[PDB]
């Protein structure tokens, strides 16, 4: 059992255990849900509060990466943050070098590539976050997840973290051809309030952002009067 100490090593079954373990961080972190709608994308996360004396806006999991794109970090927050800075450099690169807002599929590709590389060198470790990518550039509304392996997949709706198996069951009852950004903000908030465990995490708040036709395709936290 020396085969699980570096991520530069296959196990005998063809697994990379350092990457499995990092995925376990994510699966024990807080629950986030997202929905790709007709007019945009909505993300909602649940912040577990470590203290009643935090200012509001502390330990934000949702960050803007470009005028039209944002990420929600699920898993370890500072790991997630290093991923946010790369995502911004990519987004900036695309405007600087190619004169275009980055497409959502391309930004997700580049984030994956980035997370993948810390899965191959003895000297580094995998990231301990998944990153939800929400975009609305010339390719329309897109929602991608990258994970610690560097796998990237597009979604209509999704849920990560500890609540994720129930949240997934409720996200299945939505209708993704009709639903708008306004309806989703309501429904996703209801799902985070129901999968919340009250025994274990007494202090929480919800964070919620969006990029829609309302917001003039700008990624932004939703105005706090809509929960």
């Amino acid at each position: 059992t020396e085969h699980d100490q570096s991520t530069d090593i296959f196990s005998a079954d063809g697994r990379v255990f350092q990457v499995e373990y990092a995925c376990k961080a994510v699966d024990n972190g807080s629950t986030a849900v997202a929905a790709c709608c007709t007019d945009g994308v909505v993300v909602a996360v649940e912040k577990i509060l470590t203290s009643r004396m935090l200012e509001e806006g502390s330990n934000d999991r949702i960050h803007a990466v470009d005028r039209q794109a944002g990420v929600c970090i699920c898993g370890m927050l500072p790991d997630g943050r290093a991923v946010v800075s790369r995502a911004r450099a990519e987004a900036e690169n695309s405007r600087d070098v190619f004169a275009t807002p980055i497409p959502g599929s391309v930004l997700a590709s580049r984030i994956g590539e980035f997370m993948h590389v810390y899965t191959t060198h003895y000297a580094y470790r995998p990231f301990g976050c998944s990153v939800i990518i929400a975009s609305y550039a010339d390719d329309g509304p897109q929602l991608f997840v990258s994970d610690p392996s560097g796998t990237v997949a597009g979604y209509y709706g999704i849920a990560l973290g500890k609540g994720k198996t129930v949240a997934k069951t409720e996200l299945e009852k939505l209708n993704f051809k009709s639903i708008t950004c306004d309806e989703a903000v309501v429904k996703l908030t209801k799902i985070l309030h129901d999968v919340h465990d009250k025994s274990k995490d007494k202090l929480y708040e919800l964070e919620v952002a969006w990029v829609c036709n309302k917001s003039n395709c700008v990624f932004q936290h939703v105005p706090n009067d809509m929960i």
């Binding site: 070098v97 190619f98 004169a99 275009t100 497409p103 599929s105 391309v106 590709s109 010339d138």
Partner: protein, 228 residues
């Protein structure tokens, strides 16, 4: 050189003469100054041929990579910006004046001028090369917006021909290409079918009277044609 590009509704036309010269002597009389950068983006090259061949090749290499990544056709503005940056970073080491034009579904036909020094300006038409300074007034006087593809090809052919009849450094064929949602259309007109030259223009047929015969009158009539 005389290069130019013109926007029409739905597309662009690019036009150029075909001459490469050392100043006084023509080393190539059939160059091709309309260079392809992507399926529907071309540039017109003026200045050092060595420089503009190397920058176009480089710009084309970058755009093909970008189109594979994105999986989408590339917009003209991207071509123009990549080139512009190459033209700006090397401004002290090159002699280049470029026009990038193209068709793409998002913004239709577009034309960028990128002159010496590496600025980049987005226009409805652009002129370039040594022969350009003869066409400003032509275009001011004769060009119109709203032209169809066919009007615009024809107008470009006639502009190039006006330029190259007076510019020692332009001449030869007239090549054009028309870029729009359909297939690229190229055309080459030989000097023997040029729509304008001074050799065939009737106001230059009769010769100036520089060589009148020795006469007993100050009246001037004809050039002396035969010995007395």
């Amino acid at each position: 050189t005389t290069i130019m590009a013109v926007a029409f509704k739905g597309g662009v036309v690019l036009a150029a003469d075909s001459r490469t010269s050392t100043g006084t002597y023509v080393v190539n009389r059939a160059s091709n100054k309309l260079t392809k950068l992507a399926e529907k983006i071309y540039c017109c090259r003026s200045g050092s041929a060595a420089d503009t061949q190397a920058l176009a090749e480089q710009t084309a290499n970058y755009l093909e990579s970008y189109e594979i990544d994105t999986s989408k056709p590339v917009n003209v503005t991207t071509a123009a910006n990549i080139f512009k940056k190459l033209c700006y970073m090397n401004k002290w080491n090159i002699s280049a004046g470029i026009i990038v034009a193209g068709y793409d579904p998002l913004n239709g036909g577009s034309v960028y001028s990128i002159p010496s020094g590496g600025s980049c300006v987005k226009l409805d038409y652009a002129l370039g090369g040594s022969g350009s300074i003869f066409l400003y007034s032509f275009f001011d006087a004769n060009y119109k917006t709203g032209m169809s593809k066919e009007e615009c090809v024809c107008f470009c052919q006639r502009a190039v021909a006006h330029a190259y009849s007076r510019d020692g450094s332009s001449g030869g064929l007239i090549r054009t290409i028309a870029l729009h949602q359909g297939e690229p259309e190229d055309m080459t007109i030989p000097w023997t079918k040029t729509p304008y030259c001074m050799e065939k223009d009737p106001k230059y047929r009769d010769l100036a009277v520089q060589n009148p015969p020795f006469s007993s009158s100050a009246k001037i009539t004809v050039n002396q044609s035969r010995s007395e």
